Amino acid sequence: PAVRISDGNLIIKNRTILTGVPDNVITTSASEAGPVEGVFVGAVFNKEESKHIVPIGTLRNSRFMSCFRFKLWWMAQRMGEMGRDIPYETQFLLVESNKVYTVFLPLIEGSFRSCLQGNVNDEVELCLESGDVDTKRSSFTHSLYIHAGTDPFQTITDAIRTVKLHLNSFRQRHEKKLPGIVDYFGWCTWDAFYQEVTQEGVEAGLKSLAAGGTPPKFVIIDDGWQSVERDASPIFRLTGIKENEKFKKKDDPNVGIKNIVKIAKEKHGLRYVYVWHAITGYWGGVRPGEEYGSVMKYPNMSKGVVENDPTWKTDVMTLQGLGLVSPKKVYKFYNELHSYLADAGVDGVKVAVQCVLETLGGGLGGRVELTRQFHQALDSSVAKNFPDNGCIACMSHNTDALYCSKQAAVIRASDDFYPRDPVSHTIHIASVAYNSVFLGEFMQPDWDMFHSVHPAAEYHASARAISGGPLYVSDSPGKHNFELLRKLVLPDGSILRARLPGRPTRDCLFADPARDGVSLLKIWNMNKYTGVLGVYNCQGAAWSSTERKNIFHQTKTDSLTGSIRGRDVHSISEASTDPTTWNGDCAVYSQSRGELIVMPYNVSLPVSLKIREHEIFTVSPISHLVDGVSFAPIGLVNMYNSGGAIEGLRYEAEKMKVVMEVKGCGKFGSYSSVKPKRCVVESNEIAFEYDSSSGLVTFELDKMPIENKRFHLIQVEL
Ligand SMILES: OC[C@H]1O[C@@](CO)(O[C@H]2O[C@H](CO)[C@@H](O)[C@H](O)[C@H]2O)[C@@H](O)[C@@H]1O
Ligand SMILES: OC[C@@H]1O[C@@H](O)[C@@H](O)[C@@H](O)[C@H]1O
């Protein structure tokens, strides 16, 4: 039966994962389709309650990785071996058995949301909450799902699909439509002006970036554009749906945000303009009033949230409350805001402050209900007014929202980029990587803005390049490092986006690279015909379980040595043109060192990194045409994600020939065991270099493709 409870014990493929599973914990594998290869778990209690804690069993001697909410809004990672180490507000738990991997997915059921938490007895407790004292229940059958497999990533996906088939209240990442912003460079106003942003600042930032050769094709006009007011350090509330004075044209005050949209798009050649709002309008909601049925509500504190983030008790939102739009009028509110924005030429919204809803369900059916109602409405309005699916979810890491994520396709995957907080950089990289393991099953991760002139610029930039997600800076105008940005952005504003959410390697899933003092974090992704691997030292800082905030902590050495293997890129097979004959050998190109190495299957290459250093590798499967004649494309070697440039690849072994289609421009690189006879671009022979010791072939792709004809056609004649 595979996943089962027998005697006191949760058993997984003849391995005991939990002991002492109490009698009131019930399981079922029945479904709709029907017998399912894991188990839905619930329990029955004596009493009808709005909150229940129940032990699932005792976990000891089993390595795990967890994503837990360290703030209301956001998750980070914790590893361990003992149930006592499972944080409060654990929303995703992955367990390794010495090789089998078990996922634990705490779910929404009816009006209740679940999470996992550890106790001092090493039990894994299921915490069920409605978020409303009037919404009570005594039994549950589907509040947790457990599934096991031999591939850790496949095991997660398969369990999410099974959860999907049960709830039907969300779709998986790959089943949704990505907005077009994800293929272009962008700029966000946030760190440039904070709330002081003006239409003139927006223009100046766009102008300065395009001036250096790296033109953004989207912009996010961040927080500061909306009409907001304090009540008659006081919180601001939304007072109208239209822009404030800073975005009304300088002479004709009846033309509003449309002014800056036209300047962006018509004067500066941007494709997309997005704007920020809170899911409640502004931070203090909407000013009470009848138009949107807005009434003062005060955040309710839940124990697990406040245990991990005590400052949420005395947050400005908690003490001064929000004007919460009525459920009756929430569609009207979003439609009227969004119809105004779209008629002005706005293409999308970055919708922040998402999780507050879970704290405001008191009159209203609870956290799950209110969350669902507000997202149903938001989704109707976005699909109406922003039909490229122009929505970026922000501050949204609760399961209440994830399990109703039926449409939006991009999610901010960590706490904000913090230009002035030295502790935040290593932690940002670890958080985005680990969170993406789980968040990426729902939506494409967004690894946030960053600064091109900053001591950790390269660290952040290189991570964004391998993220799979949107690539955007928040530079103040004129504060740019164009040498860095050319590595990310082509002259037409396009980028070399990888295909998956960037994630830790199998190797790294259970070793905490922020806390263990021992390991390098390795992040893998895929292009069509290469893999890519980023390696990061992010030791020395993490969220402290004692101080309940991010701090520095002691590390044994400055420098650490780990190692790299082709097969660290978990799906590398899929880049091979002939994966049934491939022996697993890869060409491996270090983008910073400019070094090409051939790595046979399983051979390890040492990598040594000090804290806050990184290295990026393009990993390309070698094709063996005939004995002595081997090849692998690398791509645009002066860009971080070099392999992202390769759109087509055909080997013609009977002609000793390679045929590629390559986007972009700049220097193109490939591995060849032999010096080519001719490299031909667009039906003309060109000059090339060949290093005969490494096999590195090199030639220039001069200009972006003439037209419209979006790819360079390249033939390499061996
Ligand atoms: O700026 C206050 C506003 O930001 C949030 C998170 O977006 O809180 C951050 O700033 C607070 C004020 O100094 C801190 O107490 C808090 O821990 C930090 O996350 C919102 O909570 C808040 O309304
Ligand atoms: O008020 C500013 C905003 O809210 C944040 O916490 C964050 O996600 C920023 O990227 C941002 O737009």
**Which residues does residue 207 pair with via DSSP β-bridges, in sequence order?**
none
CA of 394 to the centre of ligand 1 (A): 14
H-type alpha helices, 447-606: 457-465, 482-486
Nearest ligand 1 atom, CA 549: 17
Query: Can you tell me the distance from the alpha carbon of 99 to that of 157, in angstroms, rounded to the nearest whole number?
Result: 18
Q: Is the CB of 615 under 6 A from ligand 2?
A: no
Q: Is 126 helix (H, G, I), strand (E, B) or coil?
A: strand
Tabulate helix, strand, coil % of the chain (nearest 5): 25, 35, 40
Spatial contact of 184 and 272, defined as CB atoms under 8 Å apart: yes
Name the residue with the closest Cα to ligand 2, atom 2: 223
Spatial contact of 220 and 475, defined as CB atoms under 8 Å apart: no
Q: Where are the beta strands (DSSP E) in 337-426?
A: 348-352, 391-393, 410-412
At 666, give phi and psi (nearest 5°).
Answer: 105, -165
| Residue among 326, 206, 355 at smallest CA distance from 266 | 206
| Residue among 134, 75, 701 at smallest CA distance from 430 | 75
| Residue among 182, 160, 185 at smallest CA distance from 173 | 160
Query: Can you tell me the distance from the alpha carbon of 342 to that of 661, in angstroms, rounded to the nearest whole number?
Result: 37
Pairing of strands 614-621, 605-610: unpaired
Pairing of strands 471-473, 689-691: unpaired
Spatial contact of 383 and 407, defined as CB atoms under 8 Å apart: yes
Q: What single string gives the DSSP state of each residue in 560-582?
A: EEEEE-GGGSTTGGGG-S-TTT-
C-alpha 517, offset from chain centre: 25
Q: What single string gives the DSSP state of each residue in 297-350?
A: E--PPPHHHHHH-GGGGG-HHHHH-EEEPPTTTHHHHHHHHHHHHHHTT--EEE
Spatial contact of 503 and 524, defined as CB atoms under 8 Å apart: yes
Which DSSP category does 60 fall into?
Answer: -
Residues 6+ apart with CB under 8 A from 651: 577, 578, 623, 625, 631, 657, 658, 659
696: its two tokens: 């590195």
CA of 688 to the centre of ligand 2 (A): 47
Q: Is the CB of 472 under 6 A from ligand 2?
A: no
Q: Is 686 helix (H, G, I), strand (E, B) or coil?
A: strand
Residue matched to tokens 């978990």: 570
CA of 129 to the centre of ligand 2 (A): 27
Provide the experimental method for this PDB entry.
X-ray
Residues 34-55 as b/e (b if ≥16 CB within 10 A, e otherwise) read: eebebbbbbbeeeeeebebebb
Nearest ligand 2 atom, CA 190: 12
- Which of 187, 195, 274, 395 most suits a substitution to test ligand 2, by most atoms within 8 Å of the C-beta? 395
Spatial contact of 360 and 370, defined as CB atoms under 8 Å apart: yes
Query: Can you tell me the distance from the alpha carbon of 640 to that of 169, in angstroms, rounded to the nearest whole number?
Result: 37
308: its two tokens: 């991990």
CATH superfamily of 175-487: Aldolase class I (3.20.20.70)
- Adjacency order of strands within the sheet including 410-412: 444-446, 410-412, 391-393, 348-352, 272-278, 218-221, 185-188, 471-473
Which DSSP category does 82 fall into?
Answer: S
Spatial contact of 276 and 220, defined as CB atoms under 8 Å apart: yes
Half-sphere exposure of 569 (CA within 13 A, CB side): 32
Spatial contact of 193 and 185, defined as CB atoms under 8 Å apart: no
Residues 6+ apart with CB under 8 A from 13: 2, 3, 97, 100, 148
* Radius of gyration in angstroms for the set of CA atoms belonging to the chain, rounded to a whole number: 26
Spatial contact of 94 and 509, defined as CB atoms under 8 Å apart: yes
Evaluate the CA torsion angle 308, 543, 414, 320 in order and state its sign. positive
Q: Tell me, what amino acid is at 253?
A: P
Query: Can you tell me the distance from the alpha carbon of 560 to that of 557, in angstroms, rounded to the nearest whole number?
Result: 7
Q: Report the 3 state secondary structure along 149-201.
A: ECCHHHHHHHHHHHHHHHHCCCCCHHHCCCCHHHHEEEEECHHHHHHHCCHHH
